[PDB]
Design an enzyme around this catalytic site. Sequence first.
Site, short mmCIF file in Angstrom:
data_model
loop_
_atom_site.label_atom_id
_atom_site.label_comp_id
_atom_site.label_asym_id
_atom_site.label_seq_id
_atom_site.Cartn_x
_atom_site.Cartn_y
_atom_site.Cartn_z
N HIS A 1 0.84 -1.19 0.00
CA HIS A 1 0.00 0.00 0.00
C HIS A 1 0.88 1.25 0.00
O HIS A 1 0.63 2.16 -0.78
CB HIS A 1 -0.92 -0.01 1.23
CG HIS A 1 -1.88 1.13 1.29
ND1 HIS A 1 -3.20 0.98 0.90
CD2 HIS A 1 -1.69 2.40 1.72
CE1 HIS A 1 -3.77 2.16 1.09
NE2 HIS A 1 -2.90 3.05 1.58
N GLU A 2 1.94 1.28 0.83
CA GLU A 2 2.84 2.43 0.90
C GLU A 2 3.70 2.53 -0.35
O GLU A 2 3.79 3.61 -0.91
CB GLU A 2 3.68 2.40 2.19
CG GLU A 2 2.84 2.40 3.46
CD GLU A 2 1.78 3.49 3.55
OE1 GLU A 2 0.76 3.27 4.24
OE2 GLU A 2 1.97 4.56 2.93
N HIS B 1 1.55 4.23 -2.83
CA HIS B 1 1.54 5.68 -2.65
C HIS B 1 2.84 6.31 -3.14
O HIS B 1 2.79 7.35 -3.77
CB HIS B 1 1.30 6.07 -1.19
CG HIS B 1 -0.09 5.77 -0.70
ND1 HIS B 1 -1.20 6.38 -1.26
CD2 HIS B 1 -0.49 4.97 0.32
CE1 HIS B 1 -2.24 5.90 -0.59
NE2 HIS B 1 -1.86 5.06 0.38
N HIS C 1 -5.81 7.18 -3.20
CA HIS C 1 -6.77 6.36 -2.48
C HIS C 1 -7.90 5.97 -3.43
O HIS C 1 -8.38 6.79 -4.21
CB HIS C 1 -7.26 7.06 -1.20
CG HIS C 1 -6.34 6.82 -0.02
ND1 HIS C 1 -5.97 7.85 0.83
CD2 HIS C 1 -5.73 5.68 0.38
CE1 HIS C 1 -5.17 7.30 1.73
NE2 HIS C 1 -5.01 5.99 1.51
ZN LIG Z 1 -3.00 5.41 3.03
#
Ligand SMILES: [Zn+2]
Lengths: 339, 352
Positions: A290-291, A294, A300
């Site tokens: 997830h990171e 990003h 998101h």
């Molecule tokens: Zn997040």
Amino acid sequence: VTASIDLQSVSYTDLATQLNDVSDFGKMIILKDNGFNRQVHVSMDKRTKIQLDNENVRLFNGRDKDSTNFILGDEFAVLRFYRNGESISYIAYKEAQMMNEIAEFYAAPFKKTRAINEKEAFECIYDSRKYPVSVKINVDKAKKILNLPECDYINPSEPKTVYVICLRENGSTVYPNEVSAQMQDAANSVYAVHGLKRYVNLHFVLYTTEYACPSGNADEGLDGFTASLKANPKAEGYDDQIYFLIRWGTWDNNILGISWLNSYNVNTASDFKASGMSTTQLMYPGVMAHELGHILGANHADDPKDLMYSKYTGYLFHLSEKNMDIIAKNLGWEIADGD
Amino acid sequence: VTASIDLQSVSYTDLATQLNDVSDFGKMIILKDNGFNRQVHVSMDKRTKIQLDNENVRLFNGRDKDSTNFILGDEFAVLRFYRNGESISYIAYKEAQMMNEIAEFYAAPFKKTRAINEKEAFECIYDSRAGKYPVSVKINVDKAKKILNLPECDYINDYIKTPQVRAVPSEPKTVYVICLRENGSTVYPNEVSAQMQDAANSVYAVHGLKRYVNLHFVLYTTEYACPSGNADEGLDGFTASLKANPKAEGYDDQIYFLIRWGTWDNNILGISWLNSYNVNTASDFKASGMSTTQLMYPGVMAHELGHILGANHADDPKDLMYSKYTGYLFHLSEKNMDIIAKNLGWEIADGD
Ligand SMILES: [Zn+2]
Ligand SMILES: COc1cc(=O)n(C)c2c(OC[C@@H](O)C(C)(C)O)cccc12
Ligand SMILES: COc1cc(=O)n(C)c2c(OC[C@@H](O)C(C)(C)O)cccc12
Ligand code: PRO
Ligand code: PRO
Ligand SMILES: [Zn+2]
Ligand SMILES: [Zn+2]
Ligand SMILES: [Zn+2]
């Protein structure tokens, strides 16, 4: 005649012999348990490289339809598959003393509240005639039994080698199987998008750092982490790589991890911008992915089954077409190249 | 700015970080010493698999013209190249206590017989970037055997016989070379994996045999120990032990080796059943042998693997199968190469 793994007595030697047999052409292995079977076609993950404190860790995948993955290091081996939408990991350490420490660690939370279905969420696997040979953890059943409080977020000719330099925070204890699972989920989340293995080959490394977050705050921690990299001479000339401060626990208000949004690009990466922080605990798979998402520009998502969902979901793949476009472009891909 | 390895301070981390960055496309690394330079193009050996007591050991080769080879395990790393015909090895162990034990082990014979140019045959490499303990050891095998005045060993009667003895595959056949550390013996990881690397490379060098076989070496401990210094009696019991061992049931068609650090009576480096393997007829643990693993005799396991694959004693002193120990690691005999490749499923029509 086919090779098989008995999940009723699976040890490090069992997984190690089987995975070490897998040739470049792949190997058919049957996963066996009580009331369970599954023929999987295992193949070596030749895109990802991993060293944990200079210890080579190999990855193995099954076919897409098998939902099976493996991790093989010299001291531990992991089997992670999906059964009725639940993630089941079998974690086997080579050394007797280490396997007992690991089994004690994973068994401890259940020892407080005795469960109605403890054996279904957590079980110590034993030798076929005592010390355990591995542990079975159904993550989805475990989080239901433990009643764990919610953890969340807020707000080429040859593929390029990109290093994901992970640094164990000072004072933290991370567990090899746990760290390499977050790494495997991060690389696979990337290679699943637009055939990105032709553009990048992720190399994960793990070292210890003298830096520790000055408070439970994640924003202050990441600010300090980035600033510690710039002042560290062991990272001079590696300002263009991806970075992660890793720990076992979470930050204040149960934050799983943090990172600078859209901080990496294969042609513009610099000043240690592409850095983040992540937990490595087994109960929250996909946080590093997830990171890393990003960091690669992913925003998101609206789909609760997407890896980039505003909240934590346990899903490990990018499903958003816009996020896949953004991520693949940052790694040198174009629509004309295809998948 | 090409990557380089300073042989004046080479450590496990130095070799490990370099060899771990070698991609499928290979990597150019410069080997630097006090004036010596060698640019090598390293690539991972994807034909051979090795586990020593379930620990994965990787092999790396340079180009043919580089004469350079590497071994990388989690606890040790080795660089072996040739310089003016002599074989030089740089052996680096990861753990401080283990590196010091290894350095002590390799240095010990040189303290008994103190040479003037000891530094040429043996040297402890130290952390120049500074340090107190050695980071690796340098051993020029050819100079070391001259300094130590090691009594010579030969393969004189290193084989026994038994009165009984198609197309290019889509995937080369996996043949396991199951090595078993003799009961009571201590073998050193770098030493064992060097004998294995020399054995696989001796095979792949003949008639393009990588298209027919992919050797997978494993190492375990066996409860068997030779009942005497005799090598013929030792190998007879080793083979028998295998037939009565249930952990080897269903693996009678693989290659076997009893490994030890020392040698047998009349200084025999190793032994094996001549012409004991064939990809279509292998059985009853016939293809088994015994071998030393000491660093000063490279190629013994390769010589015995040669015997197992049907290779006879050669006439050329530069051949691996020469009856006297020479230190050469390749089959040069046309007849031996024909015999060995045929046993692995190859035919003249297939080419090289
Ligand atoms: Zn997040
Ligand atoms: C304290 O951090 C680090 C500790 C540490 O031991 N080293 C070496 C680091 C590092 O090395 C370069 C490394 O990734 C290469 C590309 C050579 O494989 C890069 C970034 C950080 C470190
Ligand atoms: C003492 O004998 C042995 C001792 C020992 O520990 N094992 C397991 C042996 C063995 O393992 C099968 C192995 O080759 C595979 C194919 C799994 O990689 C085969 C043959 C012998 C042994
Ligand atoms: O898992 C293994 O291979 C051994 C046996 C139990 C602990 N370590
Ligand atoms: O190699 C390891 O895993 C140890 C544990 C903390 C850092 N070094
Ligand atoms: Zn789920
Ligand atoms: Zn999933
Ligand atoms: Zn011989």
